[PDB]
């Protein structure tokens, strides 16, 4: 499907991540139809308390809209600030 192993080094990265907000959208629909109207383990994560696991679908959606927004804005200062961040978390 739109899941397919698209290369991470592809120049057109943004369109590849739009495909993944659509993939995560047909994923929420293929939960909504196939029952699964239960299950909620959010509890406590990183100082955040959250009522229901279904807030984590909404939270992974909001932070997949955040990604496309800073993929839409790509300029040398932000891409430098990114390369520093990524190299602090681990090696590339």
């Amino acid at each position: 499907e739109e899941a397919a192993g698209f290369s991470n080094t592809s120049l057109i990265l943004l369109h590849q991540l739009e495909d993944k907000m659509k993939a995560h959208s047909f994923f929420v629909d293929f939960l909504h139809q196939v029952g699964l109207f239960s299950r909620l383990s959010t509890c406590q994560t990183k100082g955040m308390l959250v009522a229901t696991r279904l807030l984590l679908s909404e939270h992974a959606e909001k932070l997949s809209a955040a990604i496309v927004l800073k993929n839409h804005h790509a300029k040398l200062p932000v891409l430098v600030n990114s390369a520093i961040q990524l190299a602090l978390d681990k090696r590339m």
Partner: protein
């Protein structure tokens, strides 16, 4: 089928990458494929509104058979990073 159509189809798309020159700038991929890029932008004449089956009409080009020729030229290590990368946004195109 006698004079080899799909052999030449490869010979050309491979010298279409040799002229491109796959390089690297400061440890990052350099997409030289600017001509390979442009040729795949030139195959489509917007035949979606011409009523032609443009959707699914780039399986002219080969893939695994291509890196066979890239090995002969000794250039596989340079270009195989963006050959596949561009072949992902050519399955979306």
């Amino acid at each position: 089928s006698e004079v080899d159509v799909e052999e030449l189809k490869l010979e050309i798309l491979c010298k279409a990458i040799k002229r491109d020159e796959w390089s690297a700038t400061d440890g990052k991929d350099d997409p030289i494929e600017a001509t390979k890029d442009s040729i795949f932008v030139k195959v489509l004449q917007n035949l979606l509104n011409k009523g032609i089956e443009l959707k699914g009409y780039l399986p002219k080009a080969e893939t695994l058979l291509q890196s066979e020729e890239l090995n002969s030229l000794k250039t596989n290590s340079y270009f195989e990073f963006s050959l596949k990368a561009n072949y992902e946004c050519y399955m979306k195109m």
